[PDB]
Structure formats: C-alpha cells, structure tokens
Design an enzyme around this catalytic site. Structure first.
Site, PDB file in Angstrom:
ATOM      1  N   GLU A  22       3.984  28.875  16.503  1.00 20.97           N
ATOM      2  CA  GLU A  22       5.440  28.778  16.316  1.00 20.97           C
ATOM      3  C   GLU A  22       6.192  29.822  17.148  1.00 20.97           C
ATOM      4  O   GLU A  22       7.321  29.597  17.585  1.00 20.97           O
ATOM      5  CB  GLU A  22       5.800  28.899  14.829  1.00 20.97           C
ATOM      6  CG  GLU A  22       5.297  27.729  13.980  1.00 20.97           C
ATOM      7  CD  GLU A  22       5.827  26.395  14.473  1.00 20.97           C
ATOM      8  OE1 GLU A  22       5.017  25.486  14.745  1.00 20.97           O
ATOM      9  OE2 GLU A  22       7.064  26.274  14.615  1.00 20.97           O
ATOM     10  N   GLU A  69      12.165  25.560  13.093  1.00 21.36           N
ATOM     11  CA  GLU A  69      11.004  26.375  13.467  1.00 21.36           C
ATOM     12  C   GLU A  69      11.303  27.866  13.413  1.00 21.36           C
ATOM     13  O   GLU A  69      10.429  28.656  13.063  1.00 21.36           O
ATOM     14  CB  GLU A  69      10.432  25.961  14.833  1.00 21.36           C
ATOM     15  CG  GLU A  69       9.920  24.517  14.848  1.00 21.36           C
ATOM     16  CD  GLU A  69       9.063  24.203  16.050  1.00 21.36           C
ATOM     17  OE1 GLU A  69       9.615  23.810  17.086  1.00 21.36           O
ATOM     18  OE2 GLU A  69       7.831  24.326  15.940  1.00 21.36           O
ATOM     19  N   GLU A 108       6.317  19.668   9.470  1.00 22.17           N
ATOM     20  CA  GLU A 108       5.640  19.661  10.765  1.00 22.17           C
ATOM     21  C   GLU A 108       5.691  18.272  11.414  1.00 22.17           C
ATOM     22  O   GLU A 108       5.915  18.154  12.618  1.00 22.17           O
ATOM     23  CB  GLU A 108       4.202  20.169  10.648  1.00 22.17           C
ATOM     24  CG  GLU A 108       4.034  21.481   9.854  1.00 22.17           C
ATOM     25  CD  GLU A 108       4.021  22.738  10.726  1.00 22.17           C
ATOM     26  OE1 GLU A 108       4.352  22.668  11.932  1.00 22.17           O
ATOM     27  OE2 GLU A 108       3.649  23.820  10.208  1.00 22.17           O
ATOM     28  N   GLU A 159       1.787  20.461  16.399  1.00 18.14           N
ATOM     29  CA  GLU A 159       2.350  19.992  15.114  1.00 18.14           C
ATOM     30  C   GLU A 159       1.339  19.148  14.355  1.00 18.14           C
ATOM     31  O   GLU A 159       1.221  19.277  13.136  1.00 18.14           O
ATOM     32  CB  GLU A 159       3.643  19.180  15.292  1.00 18.14           C
ATOM     33  CG  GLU A 159       4.704  19.828  16.172  1.00 18.14           C
ATOM     34  CD  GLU A 159       5.285  21.107  15.626  1.00 18.14           C
ATOM     35  OE1 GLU A 159       5.156  21.393  14.409  1.00 18.14           O
ATOM     36  OE2 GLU A 159       5.900  21.838  16.438  1.00 18.14           O
ATOM     37  N   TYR A 205      -5.876  19.475   4.763  1.00 20.34           N
ATOM     38  CA  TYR A 205      -7.106  20.227   4.507  1.00 20.34           C
ATOM     39  C   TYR A 205      -6.967  21.147   3.296  1.00 20.34           C
ATOM     40  O   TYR A 205      -7.877  21.213   2.458  1.00 20.34           O
ATOM     41  CB  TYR A 205      -7.452  21.030   5.760  1.00 20.34           C
ATOM     42  CG  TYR A 205      -8.642  21.967   5.668  1.00 20.34           C
ATOM     43  CD1 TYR A 205      -8.484  23.330   5.902  1.00 20.34           C
ATOM     44  CD2 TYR A 205      -9.925  21.485   5.402  1.00 20.34           C
ATOM     45  CE1 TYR A 205      -9.572  24.204   5.854  1.00 20.34           C
ATOM     46  CE2 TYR A 205     -11.024  22.355   5.342  1.00 20.34           C
ATOM     47  CZ  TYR A 205     -10.830  23.712   5.573  1.00 20.34           C
ATOM     48  OH  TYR A 205     -11.898  24.584   5.532  1.00 20.34           O
TER      49      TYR A 205
END
Lengths: 336, 331
Positions: free
Chosen positions: A235, A201, A97, A128, A137
């Site tokens: 995306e 992507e 990303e 991104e 996270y």
C-alpha cells in the site's frame, strides 16, 4: 561497440516506421497521437520504478503460519471488545481490496493512456487480488463465517458509510459515456484518483493497519499481523504511485487545478476523516489495551494532513501522530 | 475445527443487509447481476481458483536470468544472419503481443466475466503479461538492440502485422463502450473474443515462436532468452487452460449460444489463424536452420490447431503428426 552483420530486423512496410513512438509526445491522459501498445521509449521513469519495486515484493498469504492465531482465536483469552476490533477490520478489508482492484481495471486503466503507468496498474491490481486472498485465508484459518465477514459492508452501518462514500466519489467514471477530454471530465477522473489512492488506500487502510498491527505488537494474532505488514508494504507503493499520477496529470493539464477543484478535494478528504473517525468509534466503543477512539481522532487528522501536502494542498488539522511506531514500521516498509 | 467461541460473530446493525450474502447456486460466469460480484465468497468455480493459486506459485522475473553468455554469443560470429533473423522477428512479434493480450483482459474481458474467483485469475494473468513485456525490454537492453525497432515490428513487418490485424478483427465489437453480453448475439461475440485471445493468440500464434526459440536453447544457443521463454511457456500453458475452462463453462451455462453456425465460424477463424501462422513461420525461415524448416510448421501449426479444437468440443480437421514432440516434455 560492434555487432555482427544481420543484428537488426528489416522492415518490409516502409511507411510503418513513423509509428515508432516519440518519447515527448507521450502523456498520462488523453494520449491518442502515439501507439499505447508499445512500452518503449519509457517516459515516466517514476511509474516504471514503482513497477520494478512492486515486482520485488512478491509474497503469498499461505506462506505465513496461522497456527498460533487459530489457537488464540479459539481460546477464551481475547475479550469480546478485542474480537470486535478484529472482526470489523476483516469485514471492511475483505471487500475493500476488491473495490480498489475493480476500480483500477474498470475505471482507471482505460483513461491512463500510457504503457509504463499501465504496467504498474497491472502489478497493483494483482496485489489487490493477493490481499483479497489474505482475507479468505484468515477466515478459513480461524473458522469464521466467511459470508458474514465478506457481507459486512452491507450489514454494519459504519462500514457501509465508508463504502457508500467511495461509490459517490467514484463518480461516473464507469459510465460508457464517460470521457476525460473535457476539463470537467478530467477533473472528475482526478477526484476518482483522489478517492481511491488518497482516501481509500491512504486514509481508510492506514487506520485499519494501526488497529491490527497494535495486536501484532502485543504478540496477539501475529499471523494476521505479518500479513498486514506485507499489505502495508504494498500500500505504501500504491499510495506513492497514486500521488505521482495525480501530480503528473496536474502538471500536464494545469487548467484542471482550479480553486474550485482544490477546495472540493479538501472537502472530500474532510468527509473521509469524519467517516474514518466514526468507524474507529464503532470499532472501539470502550477502547482496548493500547487503543482508544480519541487516539484515532489525532492519527486520522495527522495522516490526512500528510496526504494533502503531497498533492500540493495545505495541511488543515495540524495534529500530532499518537502512533510513532507506525512511522517506524513505515520506515522499515519504505519504498526503495 | 474448534468450537465457535462466544462473541466471535460480527453483529449486524443493518438488519435486512443479510439478504446480500451470496448464494453459491446463484453465481454465474457471465451476466451475473443477481448477486454481489465484489464478495469473493463462497467460491463456486474451483477450477478458476486453482488456476489462480497455480499462477501465484509460478513467480519469476526476467532480471533473475543471467544474460552474460547470450551477450557473448550475440557479439560473436557463432550466430548466423539467419539465426539472428529468427530471434529478431520473434522478439518483434512477442514485444507487443503480450501488451495486446493484457490490454484485452482489462479492457474487454474483465467487465463481462461477472465472477470474483475468475476475476482473481484474470488479475494474475494480466500481471503475467506485464512480466512478459518486461522480459522483452530486458532482452533488448541486454543485447543492445534498437528498442523502438523491436517494439514497432508489428507496424513494420507484414507477416507480423497480418497476425495482429487479424487479432484486432476477431476482438470484435467488445471494446465498444456500450457492448453487452446479455443477448445471444452479444455472448457469441464475447466467446469469439475469448477464442481469439486464448485459443488463437496465446494458443497458436505464440507456438512457432516457442518452437524456434526453444530449439536454440536445446542446442545451447542463447540460453538466457531460452530460459525466459521456458518461464513464459509455463505461464502460457495455464493461460490457455483457464481460457478453455472459461469458454467451456460459458457454453455449459448458456448452451443456446453454441449453435452450428457459431461452431462453424470458430473453426473458420482457427483455419485463418493457421494460415497466418504458417506464413509467419515462412517469414522467420526463408532458409533452414538446424532442425527447423518452414515446411515443418505446416504440420506443427495444424497439429496444435487440432488439439485446440478438441479442447473446446470441436472435431480435428487437419490430422497431421507433431514434428516437435519434445515440446510435450516436462522441464
């Protein structure tokens, strides 16, 4: 249809009025004849619509509870092969990303000489960043070794192979000397766009999505799954925008779309397919419940065919989609 | 905090790849080529990450703010020619100002801030600039303004052009494709760009406008525009705080760049900005409107300039009082 006196601002620089932008002089690349700093009048309505649609999709990884995921991860319920799928995917995505985001800023933005397209790029690049936050996270929530995960693209050959390929197809677009006002330069620029929008992507990510969302469908790691659903929704728009931008550049600059460029883009997509298949095999040496490497052979070929079609190239593989549910989550996460 | 389970580690098959894991103590805000900039972890600049999390918590869109009352007031004779002038000049300046700021983040700043957590903030900030640009388009369409007239203001109005021209000049050579920050001279030039955009553009050039527009809002006039400017102000406060932190961080890591010569040049840039901003306020206010007169902005612009100076370790120079203390209230 009448406003009161004084509802217009008055010029004290008379010659300045000529700098008002002629809509039809606007172009996606190589546009130096009008002022790129003024948004109006908008020419590329498709670019503006992608921007508005993206803005309506705000989400934050920290809004998604990880309690059940932590409990499952720390238990002995997952097989080692299941963990391997999760870890390799986190490894790849954690830096992929950032590669996409950096390319938007450092390669794409300078050469897309259009304010409404740039508006979308700023939304895309921020998305991104949100995705990168997701992987941080997840790592922190599950107590993973964050440096092991984020350095995966330097430590696992099948991941490195994908990102080394990405570096190759990035071309010299980052070079201080790179320009798009030659046929060769604009062709190289379009290859970068294909590399990031279509390949990274549009093929590499979609394959990762199947792996992770397959867990979600089994009620495993549903916090990761929900985050990936949000990522997939983003995306989908990134891809739609990239396809529109490539097709727009082709239309305005038909001299670049030679048989030679067409064939090279096809070869680049073929190489991507092979690399993604090798990655899927590294993720699934034996396979897991609901997921085998052979299914990815068909799926990756299938989606490559769909990408080729969208940029005016003939499908080449002709395989069927072994994950019909992906299309249904694709349907639910379709752009307005 | 549970035990690390068996089989929960990503196994390497490239054995020396482990060397590329990033050492926290090797990270730097600029000129960091000794570690991998693509990996976010481990986060070093907690302040940058905090600004990013704060920005993310502030999501808003202009289309969520109703304009019905503003349209009615705009069409009415209850807004004077002079009040309209204040609104139109501010829309004119702001409509392109945010594009200038966003373009500079992407095309000048991002490449040279060699740090992933700071870059996360920069992407949030650049997106916020896009939201602000949208805001001005939305106001134009709501009120039926000539959008080309408003967005081209910085080419048509001398006091607006003077601010943006000064901005082009202080942008320096940073856009030169071969510009680099890996020398004292290069890094000083980069720091001047940061001062130019964070301190001067976002921290001074926006402020007479904030006062003028928010003064209408406090009198219950054009409350739709007012609310949008309140959301913009909230964003801009964080933009400024990040910029100040970034400037101070670069100084701390490279103290040799912060010479008496550079310090004096920065004070002189800020002095010029103050003069231009006062002239802009005079252009907006040839005559007084309720609680607003051009002369008040001499005191105010100088006051905020002193506050900006202090934050980057420079002495205040004007020593004026703040005629708009309500700007420091929380909403």
């Amino acid at each position: 249809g009448l406003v009161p006196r004084g509802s217009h601002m008055q010029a004290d620089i008379l010659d300045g009025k000529q700098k008002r932008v002629n809509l039809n002089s606007k172009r996606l690349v190589n546009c130096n004849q009008v002022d790129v700093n003024q948004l109006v009048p908008i020419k590329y309505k498709w670019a503006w619509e992608h921007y508005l649609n993206g803005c309506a999709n705000n989400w934050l990884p920290t809004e998604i509870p990880m309690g059940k995921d932590i409990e499952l991860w720390k238990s002995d319920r997952l097989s080692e092969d299941e963990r391997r799928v999760i870890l390799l995917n986190l490894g790849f995505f954690s830096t992929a990303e950032s590669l996409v985001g950096n390319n938007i800023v450092l390669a794409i933005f300078k050469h897309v000489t259009n304010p409404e397209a740039r508006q979308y790029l700023l939304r895309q690049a921020f998305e991104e960043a949100v995705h990168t936050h997701t992987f941080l996270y997840i790592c922190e929530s599950l107590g993973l070794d964050e440096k092991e995960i984020f350095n995966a693209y330097n430590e696992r050959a099948a991941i490195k192979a994908k990102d080394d390929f990405q570096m190759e197809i990035t071309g010299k677009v980052l070079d201080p000397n790179f320009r798009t006002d030659s046929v060769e330069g604009l062709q190289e620029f379009v290859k970068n766009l294909v590399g990031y929008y279509i390949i990274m992507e549009g093929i590499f990510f979609y394959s990762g999505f199947v792996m992770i969302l397959s867990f979600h469908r089994q009620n495993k790691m549903i916090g990761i799954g929900e985050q990936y659903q949000y990522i997939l929704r983003d995306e989908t728009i990134h891809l739609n925008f990239g396809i529109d931008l490539i097709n727009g550049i082709k239309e305005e600059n038909p001299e670049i779309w030679t048989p030679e460029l067409q064939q090279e883009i096809v070869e680049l997509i073929k190489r991507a397919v092979d690399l993604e298949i090798e990655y899927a095999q590294d993720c699934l040496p034996r396979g897991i419940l609901g997921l085998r490497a052979s299914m990815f052979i068909d799926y990756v070929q299938h989606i490559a065919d769909r990408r080729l079609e969208r940029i005016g190239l003939k499908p080449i593989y002709h395989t069927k989609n072994p994950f019909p549910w992906m299309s249904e989550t694709i349907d639910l996460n379709k752009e307005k």
